[PDB]
């Protein structure tokens, strides 16, 4: 039933493709949230050539080390408790630093080794980071800290890089460049969108997440293959039933789809209890034996119903592709009006993980 | 302190008892499919040794239960997907639904060391799984003649619209079910949460509570589990990781979708759609910080959610956040987000820590 198939060859291709688009920049492969659904630890072991791995939280970084990953790991949101710092230091984790608590803990600690730090600037997203009017003094303190390995590096993040007509990205960049002028540290602002559409945003390090897995960061119906990146994940399953159904007959909860002809319906061992979106409407495409058929009626917790046709020869046990070869996850996102980020990431533990190539 | 689902075992024990009170002559299939609706498959079964059976979606789930030392009957609600599984099903004493010719034939043909208990699945208008009325009679008779099937054969079905008491579909499913079961031996089951709570003439021999067992309403009518005397089981909790100044006219989050009308303080929660919190949440969805309600502002992101705390708010990094739980029913989050409560509780990721209390 519900299996996630992760293509190791597509992953390696994608990193090397992204090196070619930003060839003067180092790569933090962003692998937080179980590597956007593809598997934290297996994704990292597929990519030895990364210059670092990026995570959201310290626990993710420790999971990497527990599985034998020795590469530098960047804590994108820094650390949430002052007692974390000896572990961070001894693990050689690079840490973002974005608030007073973290900075004060760095100043007051006594650590066996200094830690590499990326100071986070709020250039416009207004999520994490030090606002421009607090930044020089916050920076100056970091440069004066024995527990911080000089130089201090500088990181920000784009809020609207997927909308080039906007002008938000160029403002974010001017705040960034203004602050960076005359400082020695490395600089990083671009994730998938910056790498693809803003070559003046590449600087020393870039940070691919979504494009590394061969899925587009943009909402214009582009797919990773538009950018020469190969889709990594297939979500697949099989039919468990093929049944007769009649004209005028509803299917599923609320009877939300009614058949206008006699037909055969298929039942897929996949639902929202696996991660598949309950917001997917009737007519959403699935592939059965490599041909597109439509979802009919509401998605259920463990089952989806599709219309196969009145004399279709599909059988229980036949392969189904929710997204993969012939059906990019961006096309599912468009039809369901869910971010492709969320579709690939918000899958449950019920799905089996399979690795190929 | 980070993304954590707290499971209140006392609430769970109460709910099963409370449901027995509402269906006093009926045995209980505790439905624990999809990791017990997000609450933990094995731990939820461990909390409920009073259940008469456990109900799962797939053979793999049943086996996991056996693997963690659960010994009670397990019902395979969808049956089995490969004939080669029948020996395992016999020897684990799983009960299985049977809904198609493939399964029927597999039982007729197999040589098993012990027969298996069977619930014949009747399609009564859901049109998802099950044998149709015009086929069901011959299919039934074949099950009564199979030496690999315990007699009598039991009969199951499931409602499509039990959550609309104004509507006639439930009464038409019942009449179809009642016609078929006239004069047959063996146990009858058609009610799950909706059926149990609203339709007492559907209770029959076995009822199969899912969502209401976890203290969550199966309706989209503003009712909560507490409306029916069931106590919420799950709390989705986390922490603030930042409290930040913010100015009038400044937007927050991706696409700058929310702009503050005043200077304020923002809080950032260690929670996002990579944990299972729905990206769909609009600005103004409630979150509890230090017990009090504050609105989501800007888009839910993969690992973080931003909330608007107010300009001299004294919340700090490290303080507790409740996404749903005590003081904030998941049904409220369902309604504000236009997500089904089912999906909300169930579609969490493996990054969430599980903790069990009482
Ligand atoms: C600091 C930072 N640097 C890089 C990335 C990778 O992003 P892409 O997938 O757009 O390349 C992110 C993640 N961004 C979203 C998934 P989210 O904000 O929802 O976590 C990030 O936060
Ligand atoms: C046969 C069967 N018997 C009982 C239950 C329990 O239902 P409640 O959660 O409404 O009590 C279900 C589950 N039904 C939906 C969650 P879904 O169809 O989305 O999986 C089921 O399929």
Author numbering:
A (entry chain A): 3 to 359
B (entry chain B): 2 to 359
Give passages from the manuscript:
In this study, we have addressed these questions by focusing on the two PLP-dependent enzymes alanine racemase (ALR) and cystathionine β-lyase (CBL). E. coli CBL is a homotetramer that catalyzes the formation of l-homocysteine from l-cystathionine. We have demonstrated that two non-homologous specialized enzymes from E. coli are as little as one mutation away from being physiologically relevant replacements for each other.
Formation of the external aldimine tilts the plane of the PLP pyridine ring by ∼10° toward Tyr-255′. Tyr-255′ is positioned to act as the catalytic base, with a distance of 3.3 Å from its side chain hydroxyl group to Cα of the substrate. To test this hypothesis, a cystathionine-PLP adduct was built and docked into the active site of ALR(Y274F) using GOLD. In this docked model, the Cα atoms of l-Ala-P and cystathionine overlay, and the distal carboxylate of cystathionine is perfectly positioned to engage in a salt bridge with the side chain of Arg-280′.
